[PDB]
Amino acid sequence: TFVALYDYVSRTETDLSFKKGERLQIVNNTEGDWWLAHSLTTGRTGYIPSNYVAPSD
């Protein structure tokens, strides 16, 4: 479980848009430093830039 440190606006049809503070579960790293993530906050799933999140405490 990770937390968003920034907002992120989707730039592709498979990205996940998220707000700062959202809690995310990492599904896989099938896009490299782009991770497939599921937002516990919104229920959506999509790719995120891994440098925009950090582990939940």
């Binding site: 920034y6 730039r11 896009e31 490299g32 430093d33 782009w34 830039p49 891994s50 440098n51 925009y52």
Partner: peptide, 7 residues
């Protein structure tokens, strides 16, 4: 914000 990684 930091730069987006290459995809």
């Amino acid at each position: 914000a930091p730069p987006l990684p290459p995809r």
